[PDB]
Structure formats: structure tokens, C-alpha cells
Amino acid sequence: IPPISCPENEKGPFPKNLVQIKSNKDKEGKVFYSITGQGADTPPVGVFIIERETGWLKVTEPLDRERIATYTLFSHAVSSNGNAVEDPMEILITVTDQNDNKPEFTQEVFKGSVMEGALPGTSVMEVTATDADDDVNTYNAAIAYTILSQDPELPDKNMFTINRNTGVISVVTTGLDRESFPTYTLVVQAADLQGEGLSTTATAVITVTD
């Protein structure tokens, strides 16, 4: 019985049927089913159960892929006279991802510096966010960066730009002047689903140098 697959964060009610395990050797007589493993009889206990009589395997609560992503259980079958009628059968349960984590910036405030008269197209600094969701299988961790605001808006509103992919911030125009406008405070955003998804912001403060 190949990998069972359950999404994290499912609504109730619980418990919920996954799949029905059965033994050939029951047409002889009555069979009792049980499970072992982490998730069953070792911690966390009781997340998966199995009906002793019917062999229905159930999940009893919501799962969390970022806490546990896979479970390995073993299925047991015992005759009514008390003997195992099978070797224990391995069961694999795979927990599939929901986009339940916002991107998080590695800092609240990133700090950088830029020289007056820096060529337009000069890289200044890099901001960085991570996302705890599943980046191999989904777009739930796929981060795009944007700039939301610049303060002050002088001498131009859009002195800087950010590479959507790498989070690298560049100077895009001219007229840096530390004696009139000594810093720039940018609000930066990171959003998963390639920009369309959940979002967080942080701040980048750029000091203008000689």
C-alpha cells in the first residue's frame, strides 16, 4: 500500500479515514489490527490510529509539515487466539505543504551605504528573507522582492530599485547629495508565490557617503 498523502492544516471534524488495511488471513478467522511508530504509540502519540476490528487507518488531528513531514508506521495483525498472522507492514505517510508561512526577513532593519556619484546601475546592498514552506514541490516558498516606499522622495521618488529575485538593491539614477539628503529609508517587501502570495516587510536604510 504505497505512500499515503495528507495535507497539513485540514479542518475537522476528526478523526478522518485514510485507508483500510486488511489481511488475507482473516477468512480463516477474526483479526485484530494495530499500529506502531512515531505518530501512533510513540511521540507524538495518537496522531494516527487504526480501528482494531475494521482495519481503518485514521488521522485524529491536523498535521504540520514544518514540524513533521513524514511518518513511518508499522501495521500489525493478530488472530483472536493471540498470534501474529503477518509480519508487520510498513506504512509511509507524507504530509503535503500548505502556504501557511509568510516570508521572514533575516533582519528588521538592513543597513547599507552608497557613494555620491555612483553610476546608475551600481549595486548598493542586499536584503534577504526566507520562507519555511515547501520549496521543492510548491511555489509556497518562492520569494519575490519589491520596494514599497522611499523616504525621503528627493531629489527623485525612485532613486533605487530591487532585483525581484536576488533582493539586491541598486542605485538607478543620479543626484545623491549627502549634505541635502543624508540617508534613504526604504520599505522592502517579500512575498511568496512569486510575488502574488503572503507578504512581509522590512526596512533598508542607506547612508550616502563621500
Ligand X SMILES: CC[C@H](C)[C@H](NC(=O)C[C@@H]1NC(=O)[C@H](CNC(=O)[C@@H](N)CC(=O)O)N(Cc2ccccc2)C1=O)C(=O)NC(C)(C)C
Is 100 labeled as ligand-binding?
Answer: yes
Q: Is 101 in the site for Ca ion (CB under 5 A)?
A: yes
Question: Given candidates 36, 79, 96, 174, which one binds ligand X under the rule CB under 6 A?
Answer: 96
Q: Is 89 in the site for ligand X (CB under 6 A)?
A: no
In the chain, the largest separation of any two C-alpha atoms, in whole Å, equals 92
Q: Is the CB of residue 88 less than 8 Å from the CB of residue 31?
A: no
Q: Is 143 in the site for Ca ion (CB under 5 A)?
A: no
The span of 5-13, 111-119, 123-131, 171-179 binding ligand X (CB under 6 A) equals 5-13
DSSP-assigned beta bridge partners for residue 191? 144, 199
Q: Is the CB of residue 97 less than 8 Å from the CB of residue 132?
A: no
Cβ-based nearer residue to Ca ion, 75 or 101:
101
DSSP-assigned beta bridge partners for residue 20? 56
C-alpha separations of 172 from 84, 114, 155 in Å: 73, 12, 13
Q: Is 136 in the site for a second copy (CB under 8 A)?
A: yes
- Distance (Å, whole) CA 76 – CA 78: 7
- Distance (Å, whole) CA 161 – CA 101: 26
Q: What's CA 174's distance to the chain center, in Å? A: 40
Q: Are strands 4-7 and 89-96 parallel, antiparallel or unpaired?
A: parallel
Q: Is the CB of residue 58 less than 8 Å from the CB of residue 94?
A: no
Cβ-based nearer residue to ligand X, 15 or 195:
15
The span of 11-19, 46-54, 149-157, 201-209 binding ligand X (CB under 6 A) equals 11-19
Cβ-based nearer residue to ligand X, 92 or 154:
92
Q: What part of residues 99-128 is at the interface with a second copy (CB under 8 A)?
A: 99-100
Cβ-based nearer residue to ligand X, 5 or 163:
5
Name the residues that contact Ca ion, by CB under 5 A.
Answer: 8, 64-66, 97-101, 131, 133, 140, 192
Known binding residues for Ca(2+) are 100, 131
Please report, as ranges, the residues that interact with ligand X according to CB under 6 A.
Answer: 1-7, 16, 18-19, 94, 96, 137
Binding residues: 100, 131
